[PDB]
Amino acid sequence: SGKLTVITGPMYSGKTTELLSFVEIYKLGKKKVAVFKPKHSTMIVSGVEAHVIERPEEMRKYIEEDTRGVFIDEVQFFNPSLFEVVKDLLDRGIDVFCAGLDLTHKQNPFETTALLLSLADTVIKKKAVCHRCGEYNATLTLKVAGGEEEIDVGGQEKYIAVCRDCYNTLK
């Protein structure tokens, strides 16, 4: 069977970097891959070309008979139907690697990532450097600008990575 590896953690933790490392492993082995990201900028960069898609059901079109690995970034933004699509790929012998956030900036679970963590054969929790104390112990994201909304695409203009004690102090 295929194996599912889920890469998760807060922002700035190297999730996309690790996902791309796995893509390179497969390419070096001359194993066919399919790389996806949710919706139009086709670049996965921390780069490889990715298929930008709205729904997990759309992945089927791009998966060929000798596809060996499927790589999906920003999984927290996909519909939870991703769980059954991924189960089907594993059942077909295809390895799947997913990267995405585990928690929102308000420490609520991202549903789709949670479901994939339950299906995973391997889970890699990534850490970041804490923006406040500088230790390699950041497991949370704190929102520093913009509104309080939990869906808000952005980078350093809106978000920092913090450890739990720094998150609680700053709040």
Next chain:
Amino acid sequence: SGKLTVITGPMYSGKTTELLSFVEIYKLGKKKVAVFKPKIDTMIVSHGVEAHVIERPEEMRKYIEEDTRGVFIDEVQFFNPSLFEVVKDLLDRGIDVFCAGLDLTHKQNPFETTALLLSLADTVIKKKAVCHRCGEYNATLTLKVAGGEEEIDVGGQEKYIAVCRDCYNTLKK
């Protein structure tokens, strides 16, 4: 802060064994612990330590003391999803939490409480079992072999086997 470690995997994969190893670590260090299991058909034993048997996660609070350093919770799949917020509060108070539970039902649906705790976790340990069909150390699923289709159904080897994905798919055909 406290750290959350979630130990998960199918049946027979050594989850309670690992949870008990962590309880021993804290006890050896003379750190106070609190150990919990759900009420649903007092010892946590892999084959063991005594545990508080509780219904609601919020009941843990009755047993957590000022100097409690570690909280250990077995069979987390059977707790109400409010366990997520109870655990977060413990971590914020500097208490380390170790949870063990199944990730997937025998139908390969997520156990939602375990899934929420995986989201919160600082460290996730996926455990494997020996596959009942092929003997490889590659079993990641549980298959139900007696007792009807219910996903909440307490039992052991009379009811459930650990299998790898290929073997699960073979046996289901």
Next chain:
Amino acid sequence: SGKLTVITGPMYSGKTTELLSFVEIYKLGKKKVAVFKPKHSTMIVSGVEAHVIERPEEMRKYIEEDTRGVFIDEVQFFNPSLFEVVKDLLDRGIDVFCAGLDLTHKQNPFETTALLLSLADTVIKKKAVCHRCGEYNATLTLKVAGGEEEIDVGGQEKYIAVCRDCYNTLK
């Protein structure tokens, strides 16, 4: 090929316990094993029956054509010829699991364990609870009774596990 897993750390770190866990995995799978310990008490207990042997060369006698795993405890006490004997087993498709101390109580390397760490496919460093501070951070063994000699079979009557800061404080 076979894979080599080396389990190392100070005393009281669960090395033998982990080695026995792997033995059980193989037995549950109905895979033939051969279990060795250096020299006459044939028990490996933290139990399974072990072959008690003087030299690594003696392992050959006990290894059958359908042996799938070889398990060796207290490797620090074996001759460094163990490195080539283990390489040969891996070459034959046999998995090997070794447990042993990495450092003496004087923080000198055990030669045989060092050589096996270089050959290993996987290394598991085990920790103990520090006898002094109670944290799960002990990586060293300190000798508390008997003489200063570096070869001295014993348990709690002679040795404690400590973290690096506690070792330095106590010395």
Next chain:
Amino acid sequence: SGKLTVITGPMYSGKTTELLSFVEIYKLGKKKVAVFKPKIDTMIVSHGVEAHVIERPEEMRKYIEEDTRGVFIDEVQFFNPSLFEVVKDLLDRGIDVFCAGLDLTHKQNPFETTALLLSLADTVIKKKAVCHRCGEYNATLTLKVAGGEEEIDVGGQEKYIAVCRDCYNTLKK
């Protein structure tokens, strides 16, 4: 105390890449670092950071400051085995040390300096490469394909390939 992390494995397995990831972690935290590589045919680059090029491990001491928090050493197989005692002293002073180097020569003999550092390590990270022969992510060995039999012989892909054990044994036959 400081902790020692040793990253090891055959060529092409991402050892320097991982070492550089750790250097970045410390730099992001505004922690002073000291980075070293051996003199033997200034940048550490995986493809990078500037490094002090030194002969003897004891030369590191010239560059380590009062507020140095992390020491990073690449190609440790090429250093004198006294590196073991130099590193122990750094750990005792509270300085974290990260070493990357080959575990085995192309003849599958141990690199002794790496072996000593593996003994001392708090954490060991064995890295794998893609096998040049079969394409699986299972290469744990390096095989020499040009340049005579010497075990101290600087070079890259013109001289060395990463292989799995079965492929190494096949190619050697």
